[PDB]
């Protein structure tokens, strides 16, 4: 009984702009329609209940519209901290199916990554392993790519990256590229790099270390 | 006020079974349903089923009835999630939730939910990380802490007891093909200070019991 269908599964706008989320049922369950946003590591927490009322507390930026089988998730002006999964829910009875959810990104102007290089701690190197960091700061869009160089051979296999959630003041990425050698190649070579490129930056940019100073 | 405290992340093996807790407070405990949603890696808000205290009756998801029993000890306000035959796909935050308070019918929104526990279906045994520092080179300097080869997840990483946060930079874990987690926590600060501010990480892994703190000095 009653399939809930979310659309779209994915969105991207600018700051004060007006977005809207689509939830459909196969039929009617009386209006009693939840609206509730997911933030990156926090609990869900409730916007609208009865299809189109306002929680006490949030946001006046936030609005509900619809009924019968047919309801909508509306920002009238999108803030940064909006980065979140959005997810419809009927309450009339069991079951109390959720949609699948859709996720909210901001477009903002383009920015270049800040790029810093970590070499191993002394600590480190006595388990017999030295991982090599290059932290990109502060960057949009998400896509950029990161080559290791050791005494210039570029590096595959060997490494791992992580991105941030966009933050929810500036909507910018970071992202942490992890090089992982053992001891004896850490110590055989001299010069660790990391060759940076992304949209915000006109040619690729290059941090390394030379090891010992 | 209305408050759900859950049980602590956990790991348990493939076909293992695994019994969450739910300690309500703020309201009568047993004149309201304790639902039970959860959010496996990659996918949305599931429902699970739902309890009512008084009685004991329940009502599961298609999906999930034969897999799982709802049970409450009322002298203590808890509320239990058992699930049986654990397998790779039920690696998930199993979250505890409730009705807002009030008299009227119609109200069954979720309006409180307990803080959330991360459940783990692995046979890797539990392992506390060694924290390494990242040390700031050479304006704006950027330090941080490398958490490496802990399981299960999660780690909490805080900056001088919750003092520094503005700045503050944490990974989402990588599983290494070892099979334990490491990920990074950086902060952008700046330059003048790394000869006055002193700057340490505070990270917490709470299925190993573990607490360390790493000074991150310049070297
Ligand atoms: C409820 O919990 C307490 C332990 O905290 C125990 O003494 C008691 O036997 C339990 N009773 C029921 C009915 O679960």
């Known amino acids: 009984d009653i399939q809930l269908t979310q659309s779209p599964s994915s969105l991207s706008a600018s700051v004060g702009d007006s977005v809207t989320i689509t939830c459909r049922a196969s039929?009617?369950?009386?209006?009693?329609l939840a609206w509730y946003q997911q933030r990156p590591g926090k609990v869900p927490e409730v916007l609208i209940y009865?299809?189109?009322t306002l929680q006490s507390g949030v946001p006046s930026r936030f609005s509900g519209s619809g009924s019968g089988t047919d309801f909508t998730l509306t920002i009238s002006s999108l803030q940064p901290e909006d980065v979140a999964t959005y997810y419809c829910?009927?309450?009339?009875?069991?079951?109390?199916?959720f949609g699948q959810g859709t996720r909210l990104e901001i477009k903002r102007t383009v920015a270049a990554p800040s790029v810093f290089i970590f070499p191993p701690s002394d600590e480190q190197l006595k388990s017999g392993t030295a991982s090599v960091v290059c932290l990109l700061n502060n960057f949009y869009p998400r896509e950029a790519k990161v080559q290791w160089k050791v005494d210039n051979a570029l590096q595959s296999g060997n490494s791992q990256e992580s991105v941030t959630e966009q933050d929810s003041k500036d909507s910018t990425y970071s992202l942490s590229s992890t090089l992982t050698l053992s001891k004896a190649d850490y110590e055989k070579h001299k010069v660790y790099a990391c060759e940076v490129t992304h949209q915000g930056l006109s040619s690729p940019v290059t941090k390394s270390f030379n090891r010992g100073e | 006020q209305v408050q759900l405290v859950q049980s602590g992340a956990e790991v348990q093996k493939p076909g293992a079974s695994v019994k969450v807790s739910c300690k309500a407070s703020?309201?009568?405990?047993?004149?309201?349903?304790i639902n039970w949603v959860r959010q496996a890696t990659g996918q949305g808000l599931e429902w699970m089923g739902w309890?009512?205290?008084?009685?004991?009756?329940?009502g599961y998801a298609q999906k999930f009835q034969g897999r799982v029993t709802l049970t409450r000890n009322t002298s203590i306000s808890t509320a239990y999630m058992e699930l049986t035959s654990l397998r790779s796909e039920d690696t998930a935050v199993y979250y505890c939730?409730?009705?807002?308070?009030?008299?009227?019918?119609?109200?069954?929104?979720?309006?409180?939910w307990g803080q959330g526990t991360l459940v783990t279906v692995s046979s890797a045994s539990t392992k506390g990380p060694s924290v390494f520092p990242l040390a700031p080179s050479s304006g704006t300097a950027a330090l941080g802490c490398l958490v490496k080869d802990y399981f299960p997840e999660p780690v909490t990483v805080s900056w001088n007891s919750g003092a520094l946060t503005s700045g503050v930079h944490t990974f989402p874990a990588v599983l290494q093909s070892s099979g334990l987690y490491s990920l990074s926590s950086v902060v952008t600060v700046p330059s003048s200070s790394l000869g006055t501010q002193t700057y340490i990480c505070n990270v917490n892994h709470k299925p190993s019991n573990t607490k360390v703190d790493k000074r991150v000095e310049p070297k």
């Open positions: 009865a299809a189109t």
């Open positions: 829910q009927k309450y009339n009875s069991a079951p109390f199916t």
């Open positions: 309890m009512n205290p008084k009685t004991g009756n329940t």
């Open positions: 039929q009617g369950f009386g209006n009693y």
């Open positions: 939730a409730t009705y807002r308070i009030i008299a009227a019918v119609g109200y069954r929104y979720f309006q409180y």
């Open positions: 703020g309201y009568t405990f047993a004149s309201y349903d």
